[PDB]
Design a protein around this nucleic acid. Structure first.
Lengths: 77, 129
DNA sequence: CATTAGCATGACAAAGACA
DNA sequence: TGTCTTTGTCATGCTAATG
């Protein structure tokens, strides 16, 4: 079982926002939704984004508690 | 021995990263704070290498004291110029102060920058790889 | 001659329709 | 399954500068 990296504020915010857009836009391909979400995500303010950054920060600290020795080791091509 | 040994540096690195994350700062944030608060900014790259001990013991030893102040308290040459420079290097590997001054104005680049470029280039040529 | 710091680039995270 | 998409974070290579 490999450990996956903690989800960042955008990935966490997209998990719930991505489903919201799919229910309202269930025929839109993720390729286009991913583009509109990025456009909408860039329009949020820091105060509004803060609540999502803190949660990613908490998920990162809690993720670190589960695997305190985990290290990000990307594969070089 | 007064300075931190390898095991102690590994512990400091551990502690530093924990505190940084606990406080909500990115590696970049810390590097920036080091310049604003202590007069010596550091890049995200250096903070990442320090936290992973991807540096020599000699370099980690220099940096630890500096990052410790933070911890306590928290509680370029153009592409075209390059090619021409390479062409020149090909002609003459070691141009004189005069040759160099010419080449500088010719390229509209500061003299010292050019003197250093040729020095770095001669060094790179002496490398195995 | 020897050594350190920094910028730009590549890889990886999760979720879904399409071929 | 692989293709194709998003943003944020980390590690690496090459370049510039100092003693």
């Amino acid at each position: 079982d490999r450990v996956k990296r903690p989800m960042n504020a955008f990935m966490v915010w997209s998990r719930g926002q991505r489903r919201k857009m799919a229910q309202e836009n269930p025929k839109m391909h993720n390729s286009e939704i991913s583009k509109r979400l990025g456009a909408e995500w860039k329009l949020l303010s820091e105060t509004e984004k803060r609540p999502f950054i803190d949660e990613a920060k908490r998920l990162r600290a809690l993720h670190m508690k589960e695997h305190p020795d985990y290290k990000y080791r990307p594969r070089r091509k | 021995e007064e300075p931190s040994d390898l095991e102690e540096l590994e512990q400091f690195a551990k502690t530093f990263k924990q505190r940084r994350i606990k406080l909500g700062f990115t590696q970049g944030d810390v590097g920036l704070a080091m310049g604003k608060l202590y007069g010596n900014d550091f890049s995200q790259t250096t903070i990442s290498r320090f936290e992973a001990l991807n540096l020599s013991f000699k370099n980690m030893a220099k940096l630890k004291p500096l990052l410790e102040k933070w911890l306590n308290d928290a509680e370029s040459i153009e592409t075209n110029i390059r090619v021409a420079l390479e062409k020149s290097f090909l002609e003459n590997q070691k141009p004189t102060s005069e040759e160099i001054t010419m080449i500088a104005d010719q390229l509209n680049m500061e003299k010292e920058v050019i003197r250093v470029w040729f020095c770095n280039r001669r060094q790179k040529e002496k490398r195995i790889n």
